[PDB]
Amino acid sequence: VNSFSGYLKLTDNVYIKNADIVEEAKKVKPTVVVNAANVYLKHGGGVAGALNKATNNAMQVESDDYIATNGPLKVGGSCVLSGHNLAKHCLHVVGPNVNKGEDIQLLKSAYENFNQHEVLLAPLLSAGIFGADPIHSLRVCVDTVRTNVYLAVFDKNLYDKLVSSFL
Ligand SMILES: Cc1c[nH]c2ncnc(NCC(C)(C)O)c12
Ligand SMILES: [Cl-]
């Protein structure tokens, strides 16, 4: 039993909710919140820009030190950093950004990072400003993640289509 509330159940392990991941994070304080990161950990917009704003830019400061030490992530890769005031940890996961021409096949690799954590709060990878079809992202999530994932979908209109079309 966990404190995630109001979710619709999709499969043995995936739950979905029309919700602002920022507001969900502050309420639940999950062990892991997933960020929709880029390889440079430049949290400018989309989910990343909003999460970073909620940390008063502490996420960006920590991220800049991470990159200065380690260099960029791989598309499909991840790193674990602090969750600041939002969660214990933030798993920064880089899905492909279609508006950069990145290969969509890497979306499965991106979701595989979730399997290293028993429970996560997350957005749909490569959705929003990364330019992938969220219906496809949800399908890859369900077919790749085996740990318990609670998906927050910000757009209510998008949320209803994912459910009604869900196979
Ligand atoms: C931008 C944002 C802020 N808080 C969020 N919580 C969940 N999903 C999000 N992004 C979804 C999409 C499809 C617009 O990228 C967000
Ligand atoms: Cl977005």
PDB file of C-alpha atoms and ligand atoms in Angstrom:
ATOM      1  CA  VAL A   1       0.000   0.000   0.000  1.00  0.00           C
ATOM      2  CA  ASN A   2       1.230   3.476  -0.948  1.00  0.00           C
ATOM      3  CA  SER A   3      -0.159   7.001  -0.719  1.00  0.00           C
ATOM      4  CA  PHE A   4      -0.803   7.507  -4.446  1.00  0.00           C
ATOM      5  CA  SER A   5      -4.476   8.489  -4.638  1.00  0.00           C
ATOM      6  CA  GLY A   6      -7.094   8.979  -7.324  1.00  0.00           C
ATOM      7  CA  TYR A   7      -5.279   7.020 -10.041  1.00  0.00           C
ATOM      8  CA  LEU A   8      -6.924   4.869 -12.674  1.00  0.00           C
ATOM      9  CA  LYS A   9      -5.347   1.384 -12.895  1.00  0.00           C
ATOM     10  CA  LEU A  10      -4.134   0.328 -16.362  1.00  0.00           C
ATOM     11  CA  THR A  11      -2.185  -2.949 -15.883  1.00  0.00           C
ATOM     12  CA  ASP A  12      -0.699  -4.938 -13.020  1.00  0.00           C
ATOM     13  CA  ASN A  13       1.702  -2.059 -12.285  1.00  0.00           C
ATOM     14  CA  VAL A  14       0.820   1.148 -14.199  1.00  0.00           C
ATOM     15  CA  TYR A  15      -1.542   3.838 -12.887  1.00  0.00           C
ATOM     16  CA  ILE A  16      -2.558   7.114 -14.545  1.00  0.00           C
ATOM     17  CA  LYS A  17      -4.022  10.398 -13.344  1.00  0.00           C
ATOM     18  CA  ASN A  18      -4.823  13.784 -14.833  1.00  0.00           C
ATOM     19  CA  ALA A  19      -2.480  15.745 -12.597  1.00  0.00           C
ATOM     20  CA  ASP A  20       0.292  18.322 -12.484  1.00  0.00           C
ATOM     21  CA  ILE A  21       3.393  16.280 -11.649  1.00  0.00           C
ATOM     22  CA  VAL A  22       4.714  19.263  -9.680  1.00  0.00           C
ATOM     23  CA  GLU A  23       1.643  19.381  -7.443  1.00  0.00           C
ATOM     24  CA  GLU A  24       1.501  15.583  -7.215  1.00  0.00           C
ATOM     25  CA  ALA A  25       5.149  15.464  -6.134  1.00  0.00           C
ATOM     26  CA  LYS A  26       4.742  18.052  -3.370  1.00  0.00           C
ATOM     27  CA  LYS A  27       1.769  16.117  -1.961  1.00  0.00           C
ATOM     28  CA  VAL A  28       3.057  12.534  -2.074  1.00  0.00           C
ATOM     29  CA  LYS A  29       6.804  13.181  -1.630  1.00  0.00           C
ATOM     30  CA  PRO A  30       7.569   9.941  -3.493  1.00  0.00           C
ATOM     31  CA  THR A  31      10.834   8.086  -3.228  1.00  0.00           C
ATOM     32  CA  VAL A  32      11.439   8.795  -6.937  1.00  0.00           C
ATOM     33  CA  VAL A  33      10.069  11.479  -9.243  1.00  0.00           C
ATOM     34  CA  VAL A  34      11.073  11.140 -12.894  1.00  0.00           C
ATOM     35  CA  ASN A  35      12.169  14.213 -14.824  1.00  0.00           C
ATOM     36  CA  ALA A  36      11.758  14.534 -18.593  1.00  0.00           C
ATOM     37  CA  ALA A  37      15.413  15.499 -18.982  1.00  0.00           C
ATOM     38  CA  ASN A  38      17.710  16.354 -21.867  1.00  0.00           C
ATOM     39  CA  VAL A  39      21.320  15.190 -22.103  1.00  0.00           C
ATOM     40  CA  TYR A  40      22.591  18.553 -20.842  1.00  0.00           C
ATOM     41  CA  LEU A  41      20.205  18.592 -17.865  1.00  0.00           C
ATOM     42  CA  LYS A  42      19.108  22.077 -18.965  1.00  0.00           C
ATOM     43  CA  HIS A  43      15.679  22.260 -17.344  1.00  0.00           C
ATOM     44  CA  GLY A  44      14.177  25.036 -19.404  1.00  0.00           C
ATOM     45  CA  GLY A  45      10.622  24.051 -20.195  1.00  0.00           C
ATOM     46  CA  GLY A  46       8.118  21.278 -20.274  1.00  0.00           C
ATOM     47  CA  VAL A  47       8.081  19.021 -17.235  1.00  0.00           C
ATOM     48  CA  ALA A  48      11.754  19.753 -16.520  1.00  0.00           C
ATOM     49  CA  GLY A  49      11.291  23.517 -16.500  1.00  0.00           C
ATOM     50  CA  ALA A  50       8.323  23.189 -14.144  1.00  0.00           C
ATOM     51  CA  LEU A  51      10.004  20.776 -11.711  1.00  0.00           C
ATOM     52  CA  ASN A  52      13.133  22.905 -11.577  1.00  0.00           C
ATOM     53  CA  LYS A  53      11.051  26.029 -10.915  1.00  0.00           C
ATOM     54  CA  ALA A  54       9.393  24.234  -7.998  1.00  0.00           C
ATOM     55  CA  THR A  55      12.872  23.630  -6.494  1.00  0.00           C
ATOM     56  CA  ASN A  56      13.706  27.347  -6.730  1.00  0.00           C
ATOM     57  CA  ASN A  57      16.437  26.450  -9.299  1.00  0.00           C
ATOM     58  CA  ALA A  58      18.242  24.089  -6.881  1.00  0.00           C
ATOM     59  CA  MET A  59      17.703  21.241  -9.364  1.00  0.00           C
ATOM     60  CA  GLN A  60      19.491  23.256 -12.068  1.00  0.00           C
ATOM     61  CA  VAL A  61      22.405  24.166  -9.771  1.00  0.00           C
ATOM     62  CA  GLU A  62      22.894  20.512  -8.821  1.00  0.00           C
ATOM     63  CA  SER A  63      22.537  19.463 -12.457  1.00  0.00           C
ATOM     64  CA  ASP A  64      25.161  21.920 -13.688  1.00  0.00           C
ATOM     65  CA  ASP A  65      27.661  20.459 -11.221  1.00  0.00           C
ATOM     66  CA  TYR A  66      26.726  16.940 -12.373  1.00  0.00           C
ATOM     67  CA  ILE A  67      27.377  17.826 -16.030  1.00  0.00           C
ATOM     68  CA  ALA A  68      30.605  19.659 -15.248  1.00  0.00           C
ATOM     69  CA  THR A  69      31.887  16.469 -13.593  1.00  0.00           C
ATOM     70  CA  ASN A  70      30.403  13.745 -15.800  1.00  0.00           C
ATOM     71  CA  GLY A  71      29.525  15.263 -19.166  1.00  0.00           C
ATOM     72  CA  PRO A  72      26.181  14.839 -20.915  1.00  0.00           C
ATOM     73  CA  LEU A  73      23.862  11.896 -20.551  1.00  0.00           C
ATOM     74  CA  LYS A  74      23.048   9.577 -23.438  1.00  0.00           C
ATOM     75  CA  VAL A  75      19.685   9.735 -25.167  1.00  0.00           C
ATOM     76  CA  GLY A  76      17.902   6.805 -23.538  1.00  0.00           C
ATOM     77  CA  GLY A  77      19.999   7.183 -20.385  1.00  0.00           C
ATOM     78  CA  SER A  78      19.452   8.530 -16.903  1.00  0.00           C
ATOM     79  CA  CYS A  79      21.026   9.664 -13.682  1.00  0.00           C
ATOM     80  CA  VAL A  80      19.809   9.777 -10.086  1.00  0.00           C
ATOM     81  CA  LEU A  81      20.062  13.159  -8.369  1.00  0.00           C
ATOM     82  CA  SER A  82      18.351  14.770  -5.401  1.00  0.00           C
ATOM     83  CA  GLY A  83      14.593  15.176  -5.370  1.00  0.00           C
ATOM     84  CA  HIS A  84      15.020  18.426  -3.411  1.00  0.00           C
ATOM     85  CA  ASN A  85      11.687  19.493  -1.848  1.00  0.00           C
ATOM     86  CA  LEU A  86       9.678  17.281  -4.232  1.00  0.00           C
ATOM     87  CA  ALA A  87      10.851  13.695  -3.623  1.00  0.00           C
ATOM     88  CA  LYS A  88      13.724  11.789  -2.072  1.00  0.00           C
ATOM     89  CA  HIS A  89      15.360  11.313  -5.484  1.00  0.00           C
ATOM     90  CA  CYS A  90      14.871  12.603  -8.995  1.00  0.00           C
ATOM     91  CA  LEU A  91      15.536  10.128 -11.806  1.00  0.00           C
ATOM     92  CA  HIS A  92      16.461  12.315 -14.787  1.00  0.00           C
ATOM     93  CA  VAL A  93      15.576  10.253 -17.872  1.00  0.00           C
ATOM     94  CA  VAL A  94      16.333  11.341 -21.442  1.00  0.00           C
ATOM     95  CA  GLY A  95      13.725  10.212 -23.927  1.00  0.00           C
ATOM     96  CA  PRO A  96      14.264  11.011 -27.604  1.00  0.00           C
ATOM     97  CA  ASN A  97      13.197  14.524 -28.654  1.00  0.00           C
ATOM     98  CA  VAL A  98      11.481  14.187 -32.040  1.00  0.00           C
ATOM     99  CA  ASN A  99      11.852  17.916 -32.628  1.00  0.00           C
ATOM    100  CA  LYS A 100      15.623  17.231 -32.650  1.00  0.00           C
ATOM    101  CA  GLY A 101      15.370  14.261 -35.039  1.00  0.00           C
ATOM    102  CA  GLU A 102      16.247  11.689 -32.376  1.00  0.00           C
ATOM    103  CA  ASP A 103      15.362   8.042 -32.947  1.00  0.00           C
ATOM    104  CA  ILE A 104      12.042   7.066 -31.359  1.00  0.00           C
ATOM    105  CA  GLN A 105      13.249   3.476 -30.824  1.00  0.00           C
ATOM    106  CA  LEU A 106      15.336   4.864 -27.931  1.00  0.00           C
ATOM    107  CA  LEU A 107      12.082   5.437 -26.034  1.00  0.00           C
ATOM    108  CA  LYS A 108      12.112   1.812 -24.876  1.00  0.00           C
ATOM    109  CA  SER A 109      15.675   2.203 -23.595  1.00  0.00           C
ATOM    110  CA  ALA A 110      14.586   5.352 -21.745  1.00  0.00           C
ATOM    111  CA  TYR A 111      11.735   3.534 -19.987  1.00  0.00           C
ATOM    112  CA  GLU A 112      14.050   0.649 -19.034  1.00  0.00           C
ATOM    113  CA  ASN A 113      15.656   3.016 -16.521  1.00  0.00           C
ATOM    114  CA  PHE A 114      12.423   2.907 -14.516  1.00  0.00           C
ATOM    115  CA  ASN A 115      12.984  -0.804 -13.762  1.00  0.00           C
ATOM    116  CA  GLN A 116      15.823   0.105 -11.387  1.00  0.00           C
ATOM    117  CA  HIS A 117      13.267   1.620  -8.965  1.00  0.00           C
ATOM    118  CA  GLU A 118      10.444  -0.227  -7.232  1.00  0.00           C
ATOM    119  CA  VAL A 119       7.969   2.697  -7.356  1.00  0.00           C
ATOM    120  CA  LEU A 120       8.070   5.938  -9.351  1.00  0.00           C
ATOM    121  CA  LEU A 121       6.017   9.009 -10.145  1.00  0.00           C
ATOM    122  CA  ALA A 122       6.592   9.970 -13.761  1.00  0.00           C
ATOM    123  CA  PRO A 123       5.404  11.719 -16.913  1.00  0.00           C
ATOM    124  CA  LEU A 124       5.109  10.052 -20.293  1.00  0.00           C
ATOM    125  CA  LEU A 125       8.579  10.064 -21.821  1.00  0.00           C
ATOM    126  CA  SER A 126       9.044  12.021 -25.059  1.00  0.00           C
ATOM    127  CA  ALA A 127       5.529  13.522 -24.780  1.00  0.00           C
ATOM    128  CA  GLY A 128       4.833  17.242 -24.706  1.00  0.00           C
ATOM    129  CA  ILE A 129       7.683  19.315 -26.140  1.00  0.00           C
ATOM    130  CA  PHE A 130       9.758  16.235 -27.003  1.00  0.00           C
ATOM    131  CA  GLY A 131       7.273  15.762 -29.849  1.00  0.00           C
ATOM    132  CA  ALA A 132       6.353  12.075 -29.649  1.00  0.00           C
ATOM    133  CA  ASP A 133       2.832  10.677 -29.764  1.00  0.00           C
ATOM    134  CA  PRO A 134       1.767  10.237 -26.105  1.00  0.00           C
ATOM    135  CA  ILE A 135      -0.384   7.220 -27.042  1.00  0.00           C
ATOM    136  CA  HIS A 136       2.766   5.511 -28.293  1.00  0.00           C
ATOM    137  CA  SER A 137       4.704   6.595 -25.206  1.00  0.00           C
ATOM    138  CA  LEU A 138       2.070   5.051 -22.933  1.00  0.00           C
ATOM    139  CA  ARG A 139       2.184   1.804 -24.926  1.00  0.00           C
ATOM    140  CA  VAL A 140       5.977   1.606 -24.631  1.00  0.00           C
ATOM    141  CA  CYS A 141       5.729   2.363 -20.912  1.00  0.00           C
ATOM    142  CA  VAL A 142       3.239  -0.444 -20.301  1.00  0.00           C
ATOM    143  CA  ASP A 143       5.262  -2.890 -22.417  1.00  0.00           C
ATOM    144  CA  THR A 144       8.641  -1.984 -20.848  1.00  0.00           C
ATOM    145  CA  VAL A 145       8.260  -0.940 -17.211  1.00  0.00           C
ATOM    146  CA  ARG A 146       7.774  -3.819 -14.778  1.00  0.00           C
ATOM    147  CA  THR A 147       8.054  -1.820 -11.552  1.00  0.00           C
ATOM    148  CA  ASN A 148       5.174   0.237 -10.153  1.00  0.00           C
ATOM    149  CA  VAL A 149       4.756   3.459 -12.122  1.00  0.00           C
ATOM    150  CA  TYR A 150       2.289   6.265 -11.389  1.00  0.00           C
ATOM    151  CA  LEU A 151       1.901   8.433 -14.487  1.00  0.00           C
ATOM    152  CA  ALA A 152       0.823  12.066 -14.221  1.00  0.00           C
ATOM    153  CA  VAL A 153      -0.727  13.512 -17.393  1.00  0.00           C
ATOM    154  CA  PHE A 154      -1.054  17.294 -17.211  1.00  0.00           C
ATOM    155  CA  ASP A 155      -3.526  17.867 -20.048  1.00  0.00           C
ATOM    156  CA  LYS A 156      -7.015  16.680 -19.081  1.00  0.00           C
ATOM    157  CA  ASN A 157      -7.974  16.444 -22.748  1.00  0.00           C
ATOM    158  CA  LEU A 158      -4.901  14.312 -23.423  1.00  0.00           C
ATOM    159  CA  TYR A 159      -5.596  12.208 -20.329  1.00  0.00           C
ATOM    160  CA  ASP A 160      -9.067  11.150 -21.519  1.00  0.00           C
ATOM    161  CA  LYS A 161      -7.833  10.039 -24.961  1.00  0.00           C
ATOM    162  CA  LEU A 162      -5.066   7.848 -23.499  1.00  0.00           C
ATOM    163  CA  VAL A 163      -7.615   5.967 -21.382  1.00  0.00           C
ATOM    164  CA  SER A 164     -10.345   5.593 -23.995  1.00  0.00           C
ATOM    165  CA  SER A 165      -7.840   4.421 -26.599  1.00  0.00           C
ATOM    166  CA  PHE A 166      -5.930   2.221 -24.155  1.00  0.00           C
ATOM    167  CA  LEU A 167      -5.818  -1.388 -25.276  1.00  0.00           C
TER     168      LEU A 167
HETATM  169  C1  LIG B   1       4.604  20.642 -18.409  1.00  0.00           C
HETATM  170  C2  LIG B   1       4.153  19.901 -17.235  1.00  0.00           C
HETATM  171  C3  LIG B   1       4.061  20.484 -15.974  1.00  0.00           C
HETATM  172  N1  LIG B   1       3.597  19.539 -15.066  1.00  0.00           N
HETATM  173  C4  LIG B   1       3.398  18.366 -15.751  1.00  0.00           C
HETATM  174  N2  LIG B   1       2.944  17.221 -15.164  1.00  0.00           N
HETATM  175  C5  LIG B   1       2.827  16.206 -16.012  1.00  0.00           C
HETATM  176  N3  LIG B   1       3.101  16.196 -17.350  1.00  0.00           N
HETATM  177  C6  LIG B   1       3.554  17.367 -17.902  1.00  0.00           C
HETATM  178  N4  LIG B   1       3.834  17.369 -19.235  1.00  0.00           N
HETATM  179  C7  LIG B   1       3.038  16.718 -20.221  1.00  0.00           C
HETATM  180  C8  LIG B   1       3.149  17.221 -21.667  1.00  0.00           C
HETATM  181  C9  LIG B   1       2.412  16.242 -22.576  1.00  0.00           C
HETATM  182  C10 LIG B   1       2.552  18.647 -21.841  1.00  0.00           C
HETATM  183  O1  LIG B   1       4.510  17.228 -21.934  1.00  0.00           O
HETATM  184  C11 LIG B   1       3.733  18.540 -17.130  1.00  0.00           C
HETATM  185 CL    CL B   2       5.984  19.057 -22.183  1.00  0.00          CL
END
